[PDB]
């Protein structure tokens, strides 16, 4: 049942304070302990971009909504797979490093493969040079 322990400790790492929520305030504390001092307002913007309640309080299950469903819409696992297919030009379950650079260069940012390579083999499980579904969730849930 190993995913049920990984999705425990990959939240416990940020909820040292026990109340069962990741709040905007602790998004401030972690950055403050790391020797920053953010603006507080743009902690709400980046979270309500996904937050199902609109609330700024990302409870035990809603943190897993934020990493595996990525919308305010209950079961967006299939919307992650169609958001893969907006980036793909085939839909084979796998976003190539080349397909990621295709869609990024389609916005006119004329950039390089070498600064997408530093963010696929940060967590690549199968080594292949594309990005599968469970790899994409774990590449936002390193533990």
């Amino acid at each position: 049942e190993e995913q049920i322990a990984e999705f425990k400790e990959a939240f416990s790492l940020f909820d040292k304070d026990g109340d069962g929520t990741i709040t905007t305030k602790e998004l401030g504390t972690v950055m403050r302990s790391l020797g920053q001092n953010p603006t507080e307002a743009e902690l709400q913007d980046m979270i309500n971009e996904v937050d199902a309640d609109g609330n700024g309080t990302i409870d035990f299950p809603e943190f897993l909504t934020m990493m595996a469903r990525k919308m305010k819409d209950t079961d967006s696992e299939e919307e992650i797979r169609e958001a893969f297919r907006v980036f793909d030009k085939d839909g084979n379950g796998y976003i190539s490093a080349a397909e990621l650079r295709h869609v990024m260069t389609n916005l006119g940012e004329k950039l390089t493969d070498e600064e997408v390579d530093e963010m696929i083999r940060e967590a690549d499980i199968d080594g292949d040079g594309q990005v599968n579904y469970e790899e994409f969730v774990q590449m936002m849930t390193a533990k």
Partner: protein
């Protein structure tokens, strides 16, 4: 992060080396000002093109401070930036001294107040100089605007030139603690030096404030910050 620190170090050495170097001599101000104003301006525009994409080309403690209170950099980077800028300046001033003939060395273009200008007036001048300067930096660095910006390196540089065209007669135009510091610590002369830290710093603070924040029209300051969580999560 360390490449950027090196950028700030070399850019500050070059900035001070060329700025101070081109300021050696005298005049009443006439073509002297135009020339020194342009030298600093072009030194900055040059360096902002050279390392602006690598570290943001602050090459100025006051500018870095501006970005700190503006919440665009960490307290850690800021201090490292200022450290690099201070040592960078001193080195440039040093290397400048080593290759420049005495008699021409003078006081190494030490920022100085005009006899008829009180230190209080001089501090207000330094504040306005740095204020329009920082305001130009924030506005031109702002990703949320213009496709008709042209070179932001030149804009910033010409802003610095403007600061000199006006300020040199009053305070020799510091607009940069590091640039004032370098000549100071090497000539063992800190008379009125407080003006050259306080003015720029306050001016830089007012500019950052006057402009801020990265809301309205938001968006990319939220996106350029969610990956600062994902690289820390």
């Amino acid at each position: 992060f360390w490449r950027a620190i090196c950028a700030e170090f070399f850019a500050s050495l070059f900035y001070v080396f060329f700025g101070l170097g081109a300021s050696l001599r005298w005049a009443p101000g006439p073509l002297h000002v135009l020339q020194v104003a342009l030298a600093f301006g072009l030194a900055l525009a040059t360096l902002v093109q050279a390392v602006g994409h690598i570290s943001g080309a602050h090459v100025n403690p006051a500018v870095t401070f501006a970005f700190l209170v503006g919440s665009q950099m960490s307290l850690l980077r800021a201090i490292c930036y200022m450290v690099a800028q201070l040592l960078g300046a001193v080195a440039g001033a040093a290397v400048l001294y080593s290759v420049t003939p005495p008699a021409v060395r003078g006081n190494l273009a030490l920022n100085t107040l005009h006899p008829g200008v009180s230190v209080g007036q001089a501090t207000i001048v330094e504040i306005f100089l740095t204020l329009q300067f920082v305001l130009c930096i924030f506005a031109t660095y702002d990703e949320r605007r213009n496709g008709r910006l042209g070179s932001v390196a030149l804009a910033v540089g010409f802003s610095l030139t403007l600061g000199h065209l006006f300020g040199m007669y009053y305070t020799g135009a510091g607009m940069n603690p590091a640039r004032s510091f370098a000549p100071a610590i090497l000539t063992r002369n800190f008379t009125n030096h407080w003006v050259y830290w306080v003015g720029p710093v306050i001016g830089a603070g007012l500019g950052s404030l006057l402009y801020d924040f990265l809301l309205f029209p938001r968006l990319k300051s939220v996106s350029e910050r969610l990956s600062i969580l994902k690289g820390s999560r």
